[PDB]
RNA sequence: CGCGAGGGGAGCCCUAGCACAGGUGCUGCAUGGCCGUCGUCAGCUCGUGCCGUGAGGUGUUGGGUUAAGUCCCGCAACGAGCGC
């Protein structure tokens, strides 16, 4: 079932502007693009959902993000449809890291939110 | 007190003396207060995060607009205060 599906059209991508770190990962260069090695990719996929599942199954909250547009309203659904907290908008600077600063206008959120209907 | 004369006496006052007052005498570079000026000009900063060996940056660089740091949209920033 997995295979076929990405084999469709769901891999390789950039190309000639690339990064040597990420050779690794990469079958070869047709007529311009590169060819990422899915049969790697796969593999890949495995250890990252087990690390998923291994959390799921925690009672464990995640974060996704994506702020570019070829990508930004799917990870709108994916979200909701999972309860999971994301960034679809401009991923404002020092949210995890200034978490409680950012916080305060999420409570302001709210501060207003009852104030609307009053 | 006292028949009374007169005698003691608390304020206030006059003399004497003691302690002290007073000085627009200096220092506005010892000061408070208040006033004048840049100028009512659009400005000056703060809390946290982040960058930087650090002084310090970022915010407050950029795009449009305004009498305006006025408002908007952008953005490693997210907000706030004194000004407007």
Request: proline share 0%.
């Given at each position: 079932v997995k295979e076929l599906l990405e084999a469709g059209?769901?891999?390789g991508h950039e190309r000639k502007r690339w990064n040597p770190k990420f050779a690794r990962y990469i079958y070869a260069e047709r007529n311009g693009i590169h060819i990422i090695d899915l049969q790697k990719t796969m593999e890949?996929?495995?250890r990252t959902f087990?690390?998923?599942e291994d959390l799921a199954m925690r009672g464990g909250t995640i974060l996704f993000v994506g702020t570019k547009k070829?990508?930004?309203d799917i990870v709108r659904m994916e979200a909701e449809r999972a309860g999971m907290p994301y960034v679809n908008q401009r991923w404002?600077?020092?949210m995890l890291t200034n978490f409680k600063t950012i916080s305060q206008r999420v409570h302001r959120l709210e501060e207003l939110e009852a104030?609307?209907?009053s």
């Open positions: 059209v769901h891999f890949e996929l495995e087990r690390f998923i070829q990508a930004q404002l600077g020092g104030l609307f209907a």
